[PDB]
Amino acid sequence: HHHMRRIKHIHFVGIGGAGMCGIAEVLANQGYKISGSDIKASKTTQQLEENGIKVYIGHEAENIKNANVLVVSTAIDPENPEVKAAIEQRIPIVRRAEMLGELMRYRHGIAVAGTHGKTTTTSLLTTMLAEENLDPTYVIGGLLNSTGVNAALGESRFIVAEADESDASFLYLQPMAAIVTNIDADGSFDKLKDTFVQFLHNLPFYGLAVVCGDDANIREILPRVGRPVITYGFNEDNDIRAIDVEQDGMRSHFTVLRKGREPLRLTINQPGLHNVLNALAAIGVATDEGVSDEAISRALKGFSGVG
């Protein structure tokens, strides 16, 4: 991937906050100098230090020394001393989602959205690409148990990332493929559906959206999407269907049907009908990306979960 013009030192304000340390880890593995700051030392900050990322405790204006850009979680608060010093010194400040957007530039990015099941689905799809030997970069909002990290840099073109709908963060992403697991109510619910539509409009006109056709709210916004859509679910009118579902204690067995493919029997190593649906979402993108049946089966059968 190309260098970012004149960016050598990136400083994360609130690096112990959610979503921040995974981006910092990927950028660090790419060769950027990564520093950060946070209110209180934590298991996240103690660890970031262990991989060479200096993590100041307490926000002092001097913590942004030598930084070329600052990363904040969502909004820019001028009352924060590091933020205020950066504005005084004309240092750029971007939100986390915009920095994640830049990791997708020049990559084949897959953004996993939905109200529930993003972390699980992102993990499943990442494992499927790993099993196909496609070494993906990934950014998960949780510990991938198979690797022991939230996020890692891969050498392939792929990056799989959680796409957060809160604060409309995911509109800063420019993916080549997207998942929407569900759109659940519990601003207004109508604005929220609009933003999911906007998110999919960020796909290129030829990009793929894999969405759960069992969800009535997803079904409602499909006429507005204007991109290639593949629906998954249990219902009969889905492009991708799990049938013959058997809940077997901590494991589930099902058959996935896919247009132009022979029926495929699978076992997912996690309980719950929602995780069969999450696996269908990952299967959808993985199939389109060329992942073999064997890689999909191995990934699902032995799935170590997300911490």
| Residue list for the binding site | 114-120
Is 79 an active-site residue? no
- Which residues sit directly before a break in the chain (C to N > 2.5 Å)? 186
The smaller minimum CB distance to ligand ANP, of residues 56 and 254, is found at 254
Interface with Mg ion, residue 141, by CB under 5 A: yes
Residue whose C-alpha is closest to residue 19's, from 168, 174, 141: 141
Other C-beta atoms lying within 10 Å of the C-beta of residue 215: 20
| Alpha-carbon gap, residue 225 to 209, rounded angstroms | 9
Instruction: Kindly tell me which residue out of 274, 293, 297, 298 binds ligand ANP, with binding defined by CB under 6 A.
Output: 274
How many angstroms separate the Cα of 123 from the Cα of each of 127, 162, 164, 168, 303?
6, 9, 15, 22, 9
| Alpha-carbon gap, residue 18 to 141, rounded angstroms | 7
- Total number of residues shown for the chain: 307
- Which part of the chain contacts ligand ANP (CB under 6 A), choosing from 38-46, 172-180, 271-279, 290-298? 271-279
Residue tagged active-site, from 25, 82, 132, 162? 162
Residue tagged active-site, from 119, 195, 231, 287? 119
Amino acid letter, 21: C
Interface with ligand ANP, residue 14, by CB under 6 A: no
Is 195 an active-site residue? no
The smaller minimum CB distance to ligand ANP, of residues 10 and 281, is found at 281
| Alpha-carbon gap, residue 115 to 277, rounded angstroms | 14
Instruction: Kindly tell me which residue out of 33, 84, 95, 116 binds ligand ANP, with binding defined by CB under 6 A.
Output: 116
The smaller minimum CB distance to Mg ion, of residues 88 and 184, is found at 184
| Alpha-carbon gap, residue 239 to 111, rounded angstroms | 20
- Which residues fall in the annotated binding site for ATP? 114-120
Amino acid letter, 211: V
Is 119 an active-site residue? yes
| Alpha-carbon gap, residue 50 to 60, rounded angstroms | 22
| Alpha-carbon gap, residue 298 to 303, rounded angstroms | 8
When CB distances are held under 5 to 8 angstroms depending on the partner's kind, the choice from ligand ANP, Mg ion, none that residue 274 binds is: ligand ANP
Interface with Mg ion, residue 96, by CB under 5 A: no
- Which part of the chain contacts Mg ion (CB under 5 A), choosing from 34-42, 117-125, 208-216, 284-292? 117-125
> 265: which strand partners?
255
Least Å distance between CB 143 and ligand ANP?
11
Instruction: Kindly tell me which residue out of 37, 45, 80, 119 binds ligand ANP, with binding defined by CB under 6 A.
Output: 119
Instruction: Kindly tell me which residue out of 19, 36, 141, 233 binds ligand ANP, with binding defined by CB under 6 A.
Output: 141
Question: Residue numbers of the site for ligand ANP (CB under 6 A)?
Answer: 114, 116-120, 141-142, 162, 181-182, 274, 277-278
Question: Residue numbers of the site for Mg ion (CB under 5 A)?
Answer: 118-119, 141
Enzyme catalytic residues? 118-119, 162
